[PDB]
Amino acid sequence: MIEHARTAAVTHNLYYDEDINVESLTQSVCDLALRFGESRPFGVALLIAGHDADDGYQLFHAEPSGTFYRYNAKAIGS
Amino acid sequence: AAAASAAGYDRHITIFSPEGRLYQVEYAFKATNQTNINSLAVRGKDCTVVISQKKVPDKLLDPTTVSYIFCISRTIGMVVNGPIPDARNAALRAKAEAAEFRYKYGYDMPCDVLAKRMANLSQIYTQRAYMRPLGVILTFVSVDEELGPSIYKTDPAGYYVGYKATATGPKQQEITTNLENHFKKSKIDHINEESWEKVVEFAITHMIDALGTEFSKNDLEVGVATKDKFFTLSAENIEERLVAIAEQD
Amino acid sequence: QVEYALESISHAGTAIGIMASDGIVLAAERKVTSTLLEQDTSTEKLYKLNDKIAVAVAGLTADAEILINTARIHAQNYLKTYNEDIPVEILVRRLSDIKQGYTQHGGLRPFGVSFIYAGYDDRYGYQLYTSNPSGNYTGWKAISVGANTSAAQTLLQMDYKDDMKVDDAIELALKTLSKTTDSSALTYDRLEFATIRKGANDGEVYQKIFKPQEIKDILVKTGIT
Amino acid sequence: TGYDLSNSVFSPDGRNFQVEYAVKAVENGTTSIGIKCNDGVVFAVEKLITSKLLVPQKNVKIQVVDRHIGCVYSGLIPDGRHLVNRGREEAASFKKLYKTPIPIPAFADRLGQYVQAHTLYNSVRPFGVSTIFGGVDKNGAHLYMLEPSGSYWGYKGAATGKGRQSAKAELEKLVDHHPEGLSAREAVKQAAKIIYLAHEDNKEKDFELEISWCSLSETNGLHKFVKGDLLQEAIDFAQKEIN
Amino acid sequence: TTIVGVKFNNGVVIAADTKLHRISPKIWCAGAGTAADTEAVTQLIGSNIELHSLYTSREPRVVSALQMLKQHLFYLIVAGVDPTGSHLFSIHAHGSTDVGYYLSLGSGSLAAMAVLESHWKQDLTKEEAIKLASDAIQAGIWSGSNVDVCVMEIGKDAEYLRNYL
Amino acid sequence: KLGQIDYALTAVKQGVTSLGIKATNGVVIATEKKSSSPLAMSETLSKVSLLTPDIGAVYSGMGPDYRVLVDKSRKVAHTSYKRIYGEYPPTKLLVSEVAKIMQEATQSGGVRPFGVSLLIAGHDEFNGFSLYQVDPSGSYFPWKATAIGKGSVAAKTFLEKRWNDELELEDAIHIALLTLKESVEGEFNGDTIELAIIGDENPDLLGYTGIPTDKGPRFRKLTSQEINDRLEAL
Amino acid sequence: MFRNNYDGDTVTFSPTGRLFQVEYALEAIKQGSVTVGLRSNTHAVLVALKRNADELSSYQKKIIKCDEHMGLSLAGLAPDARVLSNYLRQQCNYSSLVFNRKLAVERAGHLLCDKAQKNTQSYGGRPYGVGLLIIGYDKSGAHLLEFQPSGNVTELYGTAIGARSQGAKTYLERTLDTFIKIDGNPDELIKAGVEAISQSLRDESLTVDNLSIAIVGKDTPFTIYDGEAVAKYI
């Protein structure tokens, strides 16, 4: 999921000359989990944090289901 | 209609049983008896003949559409013993095979290469766990120019052989025994008559004598193989054969 | 996670390799077989890789012959590439790596065979090696694989001397096999035999993979009838 | 004992139990019928009204293929929609290639082959529909019923769905009493009578009678719906007869 | 250039100067191109026609050899004997075919066709046909020695003579 | 321990008997031809097959599998050696390709092994006359003599009594007809037996003459009259 | 205590002609929060109650724009609503560039039925587990469609789907003659929808973020209201 998210960020940067929105990167790692890489779960819960000029400072819980939510604060793990 | 991974036990897919049997193929033999139709095929001196029973108990059917005799090409035809959907599949396949052969090789598909081709297709359906056997026996007839009058029969295992005469259906063993005892008496490999009018006449007689029931025009179907024409008799032409049996004896 | 493939070879007849101070000695035994199964064939025990290298096999000929042909192809390719023939170490490592791959990759099966690669090259002199389904290989002074491995290795250990001649290694291989034979006598038709020696007199590597009469002659030297 | 769990399998009898179970889905559908006339085909169906919220002019049970083939079905609703789409594109394919309207028997075989293919592989299920279809071509009137096995025949009159027993029995009386063949105007009236007689087993639900016809004299051999006064005349015939 | 073919009274002949294009035991060719013929098409059709024979259990027809030539060349002459009887054909880069009681092709053709037209008979016996083929190619000559010939009689295994004149 | 290949071997052990015998100057392959009905024309199916003019085969087990195998084996003998090397294979090469075809079926899931065992017999310039058994596994073995099918245990006991390194092809034919006679299910005559040799070349069966290089089939199926002539002494 | 043998796959039929796996996919629609749709002749309206995971959470998207003249809502499953809605966006873009038309909302319905029925017929796949209410405007007027995961679509004047929808559905059935005559006034059609969704909130209460609304028809593009934009409809 991380090396997919890294490859997704660098490909958007060289396409629009602009930084990826944090929702759109969160969506991309969820699509990977719906594809199972290429109704199964895939991988692990992620907290995804970032800033973009449109929707400001954002925190997302990306889930093994290939779905997500934005949170003002979120705890995961123990 | 694509292939995919799926599960099965040794009698739900074509797989060898502990005793080397393929149950899915033996159960496709039982599917051939389902229509409750008997058929008969015999060789003349310069023709070959195929007679089928016709059952249309349902008064709401158009009887013209109920048909188990199929025209594969100008020279060659078949009768199917089995469910009509599988029969129409086998007919569409045999028509396409014959057209593709006449295109490539430049002469009309012999009856020994069509039965072999259809038997090779049935062997691929007998080793495939993703596709079933067809519930059909196919009897092909023509008056070949290489072997003359020809009957070839193919079955759900992809076995085939040529025949002197044959019968197929629920009561075939009596028709077969009465044919065996005819050739044991006459000692020819054919019915010794020079015109298709006398062979279609002799076949209807044997069908009546074996099944113990008389036929109206509508209870029978007929095929008449001659060089450069396989054809099926209309009911007024079959009436001629039936009217020539009553006047004769 | 391969030990069943190492169990497989334990049944497969027996091969002995013994290295002298001036040569190497491969011996192997054919399993007794049906009267009508053909013997005059390519599927034997003592094969070859090049004019300087020979192998004896335990395990199935169908897994052996692919590796033997790969070795022949790779040895021909090396001689074609450098005009000096392949070192024994590079042949066994090349054959040890192909065999390791088919054991670790779950799309493939471990090769159920273990060859004793005898050879000569000037980088290390005469070289006796064993390789097995795991893809590991070891250098030896003497070794055996397949049937009666344990009994044969004790008789090897208590009689082997580092200074011995090739002729002493002929005796030791034949006497080991006649000590540890499953049949209560040993005969030329069950025995396959080969040597690698220093020429007729000059510097060349001379192989012999012995014909049945030469085997009879060394059996009647060695007092096995 | 496991022969009935997947689609390719023959039972020990040599029958495909998943296709036996697909025709149980057809037997739970709304009753629909067809009548072969002297020069055409009439189709009729009981359209069950499930609530006031359905937009009344846009739920239509009778389906049009090309311009000369009428179609109606009983059982799974997504499966009927798929056979009607195969039908529309199969007819449009022949019309593009040969520039002439598809023969009803050739159209029927292309569907029979499609539906039979869905009995071959265990990677798919059968269709849960029987289709009654028919029309007028160069050879005159044709009426067909096609079933989940890919089996089809030509009919004089055809019935499928929940009321099929009562409808078959009435259709036999039409055939017995009119052995020359019915006019399209009388076949419309007589089809309305058979759908009302089929609904008396199901009186708990409201229904709309829906009729269409395709006749060489009444419709120039183009398939059209029975609308306005003729529909109401056929309703009033079915209503005096059901008393 | 080399070709004369004669559809004689019990079989067929083709002659050439020193062709070897044995398509099947009963089917033969000759041709100008020589590098696309022999290897390539006549080896490649020769496989397909032996497979056709083993598959169908019948002799291979000359019309099958013609179909396969026309679709596998996608200026040869073809001759052979079927269960149908004897045939002679020629094939063209246009995608066409023709049949004649006799033929010749290439630079010697008109001179050879005059010698053919001077001597053809509908009852022509095989030595007379072989002689006509021989002498029409001899008239085409002032590759190797002057004549070789292939002959296919209705009842018989083909006879090729590595030279005749 | 049993799997799908042990069941394909049981299909072979249930199938009609066939055999092979190798002599000093040739090979015999032979079998019974069993009829499903007395109305069946038994000439219209072949039990013994030509693969190349110098290689022939006979089977035991499922006849339809063997027919698709031999069609593929012929295509294999063509696309591989005739179409690139210009010449037909040694028996060893074609037996390896037949075993490769049989192993591919036992390997692929959603396929079953071929329910046949094959005896493949032929000639080669380097190897001379040879006989090989190919099993449903896709494994191959060379044999001096062998039998497959129902009668194989009694047949192999008679072949062990009667084989020696000095048999001539004509006496191997007598041993083969004696071995088929004991296992016979139907009648025993030239119409129920099928028999072939790979032996001397037969220049008549080349079907053309002239080119000195070609010598015609080493392979020959005996006619029913030639069998009946031998059966008068047998 | 019971063991359904005929619900393991989407390709099994029950002995009674049932596709249980498709029925269980209809039971998945009643897992998502309520949505309402309704229409007149000039306008069609969606209204949806949006859930959240926690008080720190953003609200889950219920309404999606497929084109300037149509869009849908998604009760039951959220990720199954994006596979269908993405395809419906593709088919609208394709209809603009290939035919120079806006996709007809009936045509869009058939394309969803087609895509959904294929999953119902093939092994390894699962029927969709999402119910769509599609609204649109085209040359035939204002439209509302209910798509069901079996592969079926229905033309309605109004409906409700999601958990506890029978309340809103029963209010629409009782109010039908009134909301279908709300022409030339979009706000009253929105209020009739928000009163219908208020019958499904059993004791619960609408708020700016808990409520989302959409409208299309006549001069108005498909628009979504949520957040402060729904404040005049609470």
Curated annotation (Swiss-Prot), chain A:
Subcellular location(s) of the protein = Cytoplasm; Nucleus
Protein's job: The proteasome degrades poly-ubiquitinated proteins in the cytoplasm and in the nucleus. It is essential for the regulated turnover of proteins and for the removal of misfolded proteins. The proteasome is a multicatalytic proteinase complex that is characterized by its ability to cleave peptides with Arg, Phe, Tyr, Leu, and Glu adjacent to the leaving group at neutral or slightly basic pH. It has an ATP-dependent proteolytic activity.
The remark listed among the other comments is: Present with 17100 molecules/cell in log phase SD medium.
Which family does the record assign?
Belongs to the peptidase T1A family.
Subunit-level organization: The 26S proteasome consists of a 20S proteasome core and two 19S regulatory subunits. The 20S proteasome core is composed of 28 subunits that are arranged in four stacked rings, resulting in a barrel-shaped structure. The two end rings are each formed by seven alpha subunits, and the two central rings are each formed by seven beta subunits. The catalytic chamber with the active sites is on the inside of the barrel.
UniProt-recorded name of the protein? Proteasome subunit alpha type-5
Q: Which organism is it from?
A: Saccharomyces cerevisiae (strain ATCC 204508 / S288c) (Baker's yeast)
> What is the gene name?
PUP2
Q: Which residues of the full protein are shown?
A: 88 to 174 of 260
UniProtKB/Swiss-Prot annotation, chain C:
What are the UniProt keywords, alphabetically? Answer: Cytoplasm, Isopeptide bond, Nucleus, Proteasome, Ubl conjugation
Which InterPro entries does this entry report, sorted A to Z? Ntn_hydrolases_N (IPR029055), Proteasome_alpha (IPR050115), Proteasome_alpha-type (IPR023332), Proteasome_asu_N (IPR000426), Proteasome_bsu_CS (IPR016050), Proteasome_sua/b (IPR001353)
Glycyl lysine isopeptide (Lys-Gly) (interchain with G-Cter in ubiquitin): where is this cross-link? K80, K179, K211
- Give the subcellular location: Cytoplasm; Nucleus
Q: Does the keyword Nucleus apply?
A: yes
User: What GO terms describe the biological role, i.e. biological process, of this protein?
Assistant: proteasomal ubiquitin-independent protein catabolic process; proteasome core complex assembly; proteasome-mediated ubiquitin-dependent protein catabolic process
Entry's Gene Ontology cellular component terms: cytosol; nucleus; proteasome complex; proteasome core complex, alpha-subunit complex; proteasome storage granule
NCBIfam families given in the database record:
PRK03996.1 (NF003075)
Question: Subunit details for this protein?
Answer: The 26S proteasome consists of a 20S proteasome core and two 19S regulatory subunits. The 20S proteasome core is composed of 28 subunits that are arranged in four stacked rings, resulting in a barrel-shaped structure. The two end rings are each formed by seven alpha subunits, and the two central rings are each formed by seven beta subunits. The catalytic chamber with the active sites is on the inside of the barrel.
Q: What else is known?
A: Present with 17100 molecules/cell in log phase SD medium.
Q: Which family does it belong to?
A: Belongs to the peptidase T1A family.
In Swiss-Prot or TrEMBL terms, this protein is called Proteasome subunit alpha type-3
User: What is the source species?
Assistant: Saccharomyces cerevisiae (strain ATCC 204508 / S288c)
| Gene that this sequence comes from | PRE9
Swiss-Prot record, chain D:
Q: Does the keyword Membrane apply?
A: no
Q: Which GO terms describe its molecular function?
A: mRNA binding
Its cellular-component GO annotations read:
nucleus; proteasome complex; proteasome core complex, alpha-subunit complex; proteasome storage granule
- Look up keyword Repeat and say if it applies: no
Protein location: Cytoplasm; Nucleus
Q: Which UniProt keywords apply?
A: Acetylation, Cytoplasm, Nucleus, Proteasome
Its PTM note reads: The alpha and beta forms are probably products of the same gene with different post-translational modifications.
Q: Where is it mostly found?
A: cytoplasm
> Assembly state and interactors?
The 26S proteasome consists of a 20S proteasome core and two 19S regulatory subunits. The 20S proteasome core is composed of 28 subunits that are arranged in four stacked rings, resulting in a barrel-shaped structure. The two end rings are each formed by seven alpha subunits, and the two central rings are each formed by seven beta subunits. The catalytic chamber with the active sites is on the inside of the barrel.
Query: What is known about what this protein does?
Result: The proteasome degrades poly-ubiquitinated proteins in the cytoplasm and in the nucleus. It is essential for the regulated turnover of proteins and for the removal of misfolded proteins. The proteasome is a multicatalytic proteinase complex that is characterized by its ability to cleave peptides with Arg, Phe, Tyr, Leu, and Glu adjacent to the leaving group at neutral or slightly basic pH. It has an ATP-dependent proteolytic activity.
* Comment field (misc): Present with 12000 molecules/cell in log phase SD medium.
Q: Which family does it belong to?
A: Belongs to the peptidase T1A family.
Curated annotation (Swiss-Prot), chain G:
Which SMART domains does the annotation name? Proteasome_A_N
State its location(s).
Cytoplasm; Nucleus
- List residues modified as Phosphoserine: S14
An annotated GO BP:
proteasome-mediated ubiquitin-dependent protein catabolic process
For this UniProt record, the keywords arranged alphabetically read as follows:
Cytoplasm, Isopeptide bond, Nucleus, Phosphoprotein, Proteasome, Ubl conjugation
Q: Using the UniProt entry, state the residues involved in the cross-link Glycyl lysine isopeptide (Lys-Gly) (interchain with G-Cter in ubiquitin), renumbered to this chain.
A: K191
- Write down the Gene3D superfamilies for this protein, in alphabetical order: Glutamine Phosphoribosylpyrophosphate, subunit 1, domain 1 (3.60.20.10)
**Any Gene Ontology CC annotation:** proteasome storage granule
Superkingdom, taxonomy of origin: Eukaryota
Kindly give the InterPro entries that the UniProt entry links to this protein: Ntn_hydrolases_N, Proteasome_alpha, Proteasome_alpha-type, Proteasome_asu_N, Proteasome_sua/b
For this protein, the record's SUPFAM superfamilies field holds:
N-terminal nucleophile aminohydrolases (Ntn hydrolases)
Q: Quote the record's miscellaneous comment.
A: Present with 7210 molecules/cell in log phase SD medium.
Q: What does this protein do?
A: The proteasome degrades poly-ubiquitinated proteins in the cytoplasm and in the nucleus. It is essential for the regulated turnover of proteins and for the removal of misfolded proteins. The proteasome is a multicatalytic proteinase complex that is characterized by its ability to cleave peptides with Arg, Phe, Tyr, Leu, and Glu adjacent to the leaving group at neutral or slightly basic pH. It has an ATP-dependent proteolytic activity.
PANTHER family cross-referenced by the UniProt entry: PROTEASOME SUBUNIT ALPHA/BETA
Q: Which family does it belong to?
A: Belongs to the peptidase T1A family.
This chain belongs to the protein called: Proteasome subunit alpha type-6
